[PDB]
């Protein structure tokens, strides 16, 4: 045993880290959705014949590293899970090109007064106040931002960690009230805790599926989505045709057509999109 004591003699921050070079993308950015049959095993329909019917239309550990045995091998990497938040058909598309929350209300608590939970809760929930993003509407979808809404019913669950490996949920961070109120404090207390504490329930790494890391040893990751409280849009195209317009000409591309649209991605990494042999950065 060797004992070492360390002290910091400067007042301000004397060390700075920065991302420089992306080595490779681990997680496949594909289409696989989260299955609630596998996250919530208890709840079922009354008829066993009708509940076995719907399971036919949809569908553990191994030496410390958890594996799913339904897939024999994977070709595009670690497979990403997708949630589904029900949304009215009339929600505006102009919310979707700019980075924001998947609920209809902006949830940045950093702007609020320090140690004021009631003022911070009033930003998240109360609808006498139009959005900190928008002054026109109160909420994009009242199915997710409302107090007892289905967004707040499904995904405001604090993680419970069964003996089974358990699974990660991307939407759980944006809807969980108690993990958002942790950032209500002053700025420099949030900067001091940004790198020192690994936050509440992130995903695993080098697995088949995205599991929530229940064994935090030497997992190094940091994630800027908790602090800044936004989610970055990707390529969307309601038809195959309008994705061809984005790669023929990027400037004279039309974002909204009569029935269809396109969202150009705004992400901190800018990938090389190459379909065919035409390359659009």
């Amino acid at each position: 045993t060797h004992e070492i004591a360390s002290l910091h003699t400067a007042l301000g921050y004397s060390s700075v880290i920065a991302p420089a070079h992306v080595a490779a993308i681990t997680t496949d950015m594909g289409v696989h959705c989260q299955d609630l049959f596998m996250i919530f095993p208890g709840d079922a329909y009354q008829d066993r014949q009708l509940h076995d019917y719907i399971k036919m239309k949809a569908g553990g550990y191994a030496a410390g590293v958890p594996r799913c045995e339904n897939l024999p091998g994977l070709s595009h990497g670690q497979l990403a899970t997708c949630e589904i938040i029900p949304t009215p058909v009339t929600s505006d598309v102009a919310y979707f090109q700019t980075p924001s929350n998947p609920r209809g209300r902006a949830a940045c608590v950093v702007s609020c007064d320090a140690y004021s939970n009631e003022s911070a809760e009033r930003l998240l929930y109360d609808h006498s106040i139009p959005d900190p993003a928008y002054e026109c509407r109160s909420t994009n979808n009242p199915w997710a931002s409302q107090r007892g809404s289905l967004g707040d019913v499904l995904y405001n669950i604090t993680f419970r960690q069964t003996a089974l490996p358990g699974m990660y949920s991307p939407c759980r961070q944006f809807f969980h009230k108690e993990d958002i109120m942790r950032y209500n404090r002053g700025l420099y207390t949030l900067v001091n805790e940004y790198s020192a504490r690994l936050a509440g329930a992130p995903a695993t790494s080098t697995t088949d599926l995205q599991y929530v890391v229940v064994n935090g040893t030497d997992v190094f990751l940091d994630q800027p989505c908790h602090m800044l409280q936004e989610a970055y849009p990707t390529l969307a195209a309601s038809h195959r045709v309008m994705l061809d317009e984005y790669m023929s000409n990027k400037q004279t591309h039309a974002p909204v057509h009569m029935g269809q649209y396109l969202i150009e991605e705004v992400a901190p990494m800018k990938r090389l999109l190459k379909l065919g042999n035409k390359v659009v950065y």
Binding site: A20, G30, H76, V93, S111, D222, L235, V256, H257
Partner: protein, 393 residues
């Protein structure tokens, strides 16, 4: 048939003080750290004010006092000695095969003892780097906090909202900056204004700023260490030359022993100074002397003035006027099969629609699309592009 060669490894012994990481630290050897309860460093910051004669109420004299404390760390190791190894360590004056049975058993216990020391010397370089990685906030937070022009008035509600918009705008544009150098036609000057802005953002205001600790050849001043992986160090060493690649530094640690009059107060009371003798000559030997940096520097650099200076193999670089050493620590991590902490993973969240409507005055802007535009059509899926540029529905 016969053997041709029997070849082994000799473990590359790298201690803490030979690496350039010790430019970011101040090393003092401390005999009995098992006996310490707490550390303490005590600041007293006297703040001057401008006197101006507008309609202000003028400020009186201000004063701040800052308390810092140590952080304990523990390192473990492991040695498993064999049963018969300890058993035949004792009997000898047997046949000459039992001498070489004996002499091959002392080789086992010494190579097991080098392993106990190497696994402890790697632990310093690990735990000192883990100290640095906890107190290292990223660029996009600290760049906008490192300029006083945004917060001269104070952090009210409208300034905080005005900085959150700037953490986002700096995270989208200026992230992965060395990967953006290929696509930019300007290129090698974009990285240099990015990386010198990382230099200007770090608080250079250290207590030991006047202490001489590292020098180059010809007495120039080393200021800071940037640490990368091997793949990034190939880039930055090609973009900027390794102008000198040898620095000077102390050969050993600074000693602190509790001998003398420190020992009486350590036993009688529960406390103990650091450098009691220099601390006594300020109070009782020569009182009422105002502190002046030209004559007070010898009491700051306690020990670290006049440690034997030796040549340190490094790799320096010119950034602005400030010389920066460049390290890479993969050789101390890939030989032990532990993953390097500078290799690092970043998670993003990807927000995404499917299946909307568009309102009653429908419009278009495209010149070239002939098909879909009928109002009876309804889109029930959206197309996403993978990591490998394969579109999926």
């Amino acid at each position: 048939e016969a053997l041709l060669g029997v070849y082994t490894n000799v473990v590359e012994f790298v201690k803490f003080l030979e690496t350039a990481l010790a430019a970011a630290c101040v090393n003092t050897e401390f005999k009995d750290l098992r006996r310490m309860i707490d550390g303490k460093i005590q600041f007293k910051i006297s703040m001057p004010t401008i006197a101006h004669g507008d309609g202000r109420r003028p400020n009186k004299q201000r004063q701040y006092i800052v308390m810092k404390a140590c952080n304990k760390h523990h390192i473990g190791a492991e040695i498993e000695l064999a049963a018969a190894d300890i058993e035949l360590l004792f009997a000898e004056k047997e046949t000459p095969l039992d001498f070489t049975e004996y002499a091959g058993a002392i080789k086992t216990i010494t190579s097991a003892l080098q392993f106990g020391m190497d696994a402890l010397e790697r632990g310093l370089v690990d735990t000192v780097l883990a100290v640095k990685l906890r107190h290292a906030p990223p660029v996009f937070i600290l760049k906008t906090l490192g300029d006083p022009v945004y917060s001269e008035r104070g952090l009210k509600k409208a300034v905080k909202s005005d900085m959150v918009s700037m953490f986002k705008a700096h995270l989208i544009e200026h992230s992965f900056f060395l990967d953006k150098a290929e696509l930019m036609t300007r290129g090698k000057q974009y990285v240099l204004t990015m990386l010198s802005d990382m230099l200007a953002a770090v608080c250079e205001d250290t207590v030991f700023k006047g202490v001489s600790t590292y020098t180059t050849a010809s007495g120039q001043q080393v200021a800071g260490v940037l640490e990368t992986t091997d793949s990034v160090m190939r880039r930055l060493m090609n973009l900027l030359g390794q102008v000198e690649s040898a620095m000077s530094g102390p050969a050993a640690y600074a000693s602190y022993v509790v001998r003398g009059a420190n020992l009486v107060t350590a036993v009688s009371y529960g406390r103990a100074m650091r450098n009691f003798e220099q601390f006594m000559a300020r109070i009782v030997d020569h009182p009422n002397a105002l502190p002046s940096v030209e004559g007070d520097k010898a009491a700051l650099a306690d020990g670290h003035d006049e440690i034997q200076r030796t040549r340190i193999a490094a790799s320096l670089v010119k950034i602005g006027d400030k010389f920066v050493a460049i390290e890479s620590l993969q050789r101390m991590y890939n030989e032990t099969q532990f993953p390097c902490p500078l290799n690092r993973r970043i998670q993003y969240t990807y927000f995404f629609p499917v299946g909307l409507h568009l309102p009653v005055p429908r419009y278009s802007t495209s010149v070239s699309v002939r098909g879909v535009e009928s109002p009876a059509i309804q889109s029930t899926e959206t197309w996403v592009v993978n990591k490998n540029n394969v579109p999926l529905c």
